[PDB]
Write a protein that binds this ligand. Structure first.
Ligand SMILES: Nc1ncnc2c1ncn2[C@@H]1O[C@H](COP(=O)(O)OP(=O)(O)OP(=O)(O)O)[C@@H](O)[C@H]1O
Ligand SMILES: Nc1nc2c(ncn2[C@@H]2O[C@H](COP(=O)(O)OP(=O)(O)O)[C@@H](O)[C@H]2O)c(=O)[nH]1
Ligand SMILES: Nc1nc2c(ncn2[C@@H]2O[C@H](COP(=O)(O)OP(=O)(O)O)[C@@H](O)[C@H]2O)c(=O)[nH]1
Ligand SMILES: Nc1nc2c(ncn2[C@@H]2O[C@H](COP(=O)(O)OP(=O)(O)O)[C@@H](O)[C@H]2O)c(=O)[nH]1
Ligand SMILES: Nc1nc2c(ncn2[C@@H]2O[C@H](COP(=O)(O)OP(=O)(O)O)[C@@H](O)[C@H]2O)c(=O)[nH]1
Ligand SMILES: Nc1nc2c(ncn2[C@@H]2O[C@H](COP(=O)(O)O)[C@@H](O)[C@H]2O)c(=O)[nH]1
Ligand SMILES: Nc1nc2c(ncn2[C@@H]2O[C@H](COP(=O)(O)O)[C@@H](O)[C@H]2O)c(=O)[nH]1
Lengths: 88, 488, 58, 56, 56, 58
């Protein structure tokens, strides 16, 4: 999706956010390599101290079109990650 | 026909003894050998709020804490950062000795200097130093308020003061301190007491108040932030004379640790813990006698002990406190490897039943993982409780995170122990107040207004207990659930 | 006491209690029933957190 | 008021028997049927190094 | 040698200079014991840890 | 983060220390210019900050 949208969008100088599926540095590089101008991060940044909410099974934080937010999504949990002042 | 409700209390008389067990009936060994999870404390009568509960606790014959919390001397739990905050929050930290003697004394030193009334021998600078030099000292010491003396010595003639805002946005790092330092410094004359010098400091709304003698020489200094640290931590464990946080440290009992102690003493140590798996030895007894007459103002906690005979020996040597526990600790195998140890609940009761008669407070060390263990440890006679694995993994414990976990270790690495890992727990600035508040509520449920009242009500048979069958321990916790997800 | 004289036709169950002394207190207050249990419940940790409770059968 | 530390050892006398159990008290069958993991040995007094222990 | 050295240290913790002295001190009631509740056996070993990794 | 704080939070001279402490908790900062009418575009009479109310007991 990134390649074929950006191959067309970049011709018009329209930057594109590569959104979804990013979990580590390698995905960011590849997203940009295919044409993306920036990358959006959801699960990666959930569980950091700056992310909203509180901690609580088996350090986790609840995550997420989910029925709760409103079904095209689910409710889950992600691990604690510290502050983005170090992670970014 | 039934009985009149009016006679309900009158009818309680017709029963032989109070419902439940006294502590004596709970701990006889012939009927035996039990731990914290094998019994509960029965509730009493509530007629006061939980905020009214006092948790003042004796650490030694002379030292009292506002909270019975003591961080264990292990290189994964207690270094300077841990010791400072345990003290601020009403307890104390015992710095580990898995490090050279100079390194341990420095750690003690950083605890004793974290908060001051009169800063003795404050870090100064000479007029020849540069901005580049003053920035280096901020990175080394953590503060940037430096009185400027003519010779660069703490006792030189006061020429000015330089602080964070005097070097913040200075573009030329080669400037001399003399060019940008504040020369007309507000000071207090030596001899001024603390309450009087605090008032001068407040009125100027300035950060520092150097103290000078008649010659104009520096002698000490005050910091506006030490007044803040006091307001933020009204329960901090600190000396009434110097206003510095109390600090503890562990040592061995061999010859080399006599010089080690002296260097710790020099650094301001208030209490030393004699770190031994089996403390009732000739080597440790000699150490206790030697510390009482060589550093008489130093409080000595001996241990570990688990029997009445051990306690008598180390008390007779002059111990000011006893550390109880042998093998009950998380990641401890002395009982499997040495076949020698004791169930922790039984050790606490039988040592403290003897030790308390001599006014020797006892630390309940090992096997503590939650508020209930703390309550039970104290119920059986302990004056404070030591925590290791509980506080490992917190932000203040020393180490780096990484299957968030921190490596936890007296093993071959540091065999009577193992190496392990504990989970992240956040900062003790939230976790200690939680245990404190939790102990208050539990004292309310029991019907005692203070730990001192807690100890009296147990020994008198007022407080009651119940034996724990393996099946009731499952009820007391979570059971019959598909999943379950304390604080925060 | 306040419920017995303000809404006398209302039945009052007090609790929770786990000891004979607790029961005597709340009966003497005028309780019409007693709720027994402290920490024995599914998903209940008062015994771990407060060290205070009792095996339910006893 | 507390007791004098000087009397700590003298005070051990006032107790009926030594802290813990003798081996007899540990092994009576009527009070029973135990293995190695069901008991510990309590520590005593150390006044010698471990290299001095003979295991003949 | 590890078991040998280990038994030496355990005899020290107990306060006996030899196995022969060990046998005499038990039969005389000097050495003391404690019954083991299933809960104390968990304390004596490793407990309340995510993982744990003796000799070498 | 600002360069020029447009419409900075101000306070009137009638406000008390108790009021300035409440505002610090609500807005997160204590640096308040004091204007005669309490409005951001009023006449400047002074400024009050953290160190001006830190150790005030009244
Ligand atoms: N006791 C004093 N007498 C005179 N001038 C002082 C005194 N203490 C600080 N100053 C001057 O006032 C300014 C710093 O005041 P302070 O030292 O109170 O601020 P800080 O130390 O910079 O803390 P912050 O980081 O909040 O500014 C500097 O210009 C310094 O020269
Ligand atoms: N300079 C300075 N003064 C202190 C400090 N701690 C307490 N004081 C002063 O001691 C007085 C009483 O303090 P208080 O909170 O009642 O008890 P304390 O915290 O145990 O000393 C106050 O006037 C404080 O200003 C400190 O750390 N530094
Ligand atoms: N400036 C200074 N502070 C010290 C010294 N020794 C201990 N401290 C403490 O370190 C803390 C410094 O806090 P702060 O004054 O806000 O830092 P600064 O503004 O850079 O000086 C105070 O609590 C002091 O009591 C010292 O030698 N110089
Ligand atoms: N008051 C104020 N001035 C700023 C701020 N950011 C930048 N400046 C000033 O704008 C100028 C250029 O700053 P610069 O280092 O190039 O970073 P930039 O402005 O953020 O791109 C400098 O004089 C800065 O002091 C700000 O947030 N507040
Ligand atoms: N004092 C103040 N600061 C503001 C306001 N709005 C935004 N800020 C920002 O909040 C921060 C406050 O700085 P701070 O050093 O905390 O000031 P102080 O705490 O009030 O002493 C600065 O970055 C300001 O630009 C305002 O209305 N008043
Ligand atoms: N037997 C034994 N006990 C240890 C060792 N290291 C620490 N301990 C004890 O275990 C306590 C901490 O246990 P925890 O509180 O994690 O259950 C320490 O304060 C100390 O008394 C060791 O290597 N062997
Ligand atoms: N200690 C404690 N007990 C609770 C709590 N919530 C409910 N309970 C008790 O547990 C009972 C239900 O337990 P269950 O029948 O699921 O085993 C309730 O009727 C109530 O008495 C709680 O938060 N803490």
């Amino acid at each position: 999706a990134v390649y074929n949208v950006t191959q067309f969008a970049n011709q018009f100088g329209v930057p594109c956010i590569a959104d979804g599926g990013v979990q580590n540095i390698g995905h960011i590089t590849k997203a940009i390599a295919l044409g993306a101008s920036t990358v959006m991060m959801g699960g990666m940044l959930a569980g950091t101290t700056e992310s909203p909410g509180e901690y609580f099974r088996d350090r986790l934080k609840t995550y997420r079109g989910s029925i709760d937010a409103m079904a095209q999504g689910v409710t889950g949990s992600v691990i604690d990650k510290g502050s983005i002042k170090k992670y970014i | 026909t039934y009985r009149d409700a009016a006679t309900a209390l009158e009818h309680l008389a017709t029963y032989a003894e109070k419902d439940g067990l006294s502590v004596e009936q709970l701990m006889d060994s012939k009927t035996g050998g039990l731990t914290y999870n094998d019994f509960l404390v029965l509730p009493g009568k509530i007629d006061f709020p939980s905020s009214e509960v006092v948790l003042s606790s004796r650490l030694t014959k002379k030292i009292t804490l506002n909270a019975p919390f003591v961080s264990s001397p292990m290189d994964t739990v207690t270094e300077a950062d841990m010791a400072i905050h345990m003290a601020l929050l009403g307890g104390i930290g015992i710095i580990h000795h898995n490090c050279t003697a100079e390194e341990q004394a420095e750690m003690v030193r950083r605890v004793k200097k974290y908060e001051n009334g009169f800063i003795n021998a404050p870090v100064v600078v000479g007029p020849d130093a540069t901005v580049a030099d003053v920035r280096r000292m901020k990175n080394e010491f953590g503060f940037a308020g430096f009185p400027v003396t003519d010779d660069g010595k703490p006792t030189g003639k006061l020429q000015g003061i330089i602080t964070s805002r005097d070097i913040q946005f200075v573009e030329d790092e080669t400037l001399l301190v003399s060019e940008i330092m504040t020369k007309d410094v507000i000071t207090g004359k030596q001899g001024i007491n603390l309450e009087e010098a605090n008032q001068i400091l407040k009125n100027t709304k300035k950060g520092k108040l150097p103290i000078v003698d008649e010659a104009g020489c520096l002698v000490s200094m005050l910091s506006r932030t030490d007044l803040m640290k006091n307001q933020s931590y009204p329960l901090a464990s600190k000396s009434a004379d110097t206003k510095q946080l109390l600090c503890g440290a562990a040592i061995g009992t061999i010859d080399a640790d006599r010089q080690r102690l002296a260097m710790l003493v020099e650094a301001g140590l208030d209490v030393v813990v004699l770190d031994s798996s089996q403390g009732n030895s000739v080597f440790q007894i000699n150490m206790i006698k030697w510390i009482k007459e060589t550093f008489p103002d130093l409080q000595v906690i001996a241990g570990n002990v688990v029997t009445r005979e051990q306690a008598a020996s180390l008390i007779h040597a002059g111990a000011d406190g006893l550390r109880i526990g042998m093998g009950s600790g998380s990641i401890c195998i002395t009982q499997e490897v040495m076949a020698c140890g004791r169930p922790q609940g039984t050790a606490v009761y039988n040592v403290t039943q003897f030790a308390n008669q001599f006014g020797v407070p006892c630390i309940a060390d090992g096997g503590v993982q939650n508020i209930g263990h703390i309550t039970k440890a104290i119920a059986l006679g302990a004056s404070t409780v030591m925590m290791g694995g509980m506080l490992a993994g917190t932000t203040e414990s020393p180490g780096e995170y990484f299957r968030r976990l921190k490596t936890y270790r007296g093993s071959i690495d540091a065999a009577q122990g193992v190496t392990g890992s504990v989970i992240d727990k956040g900062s003790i600035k939230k976790y200690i107040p939680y245990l404190y508040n939790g102990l208050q509520h539990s004292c309310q449920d029991i019907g005692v207004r203070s730990l001192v009242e807690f100890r009296e009500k147990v020994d008198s048979g007022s407080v009651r207990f119940e034996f724990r069958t393996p099946s009731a321990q499952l009820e007391g916790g979570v059971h019959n659930l598909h999943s379950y997800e304390l604080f925060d």
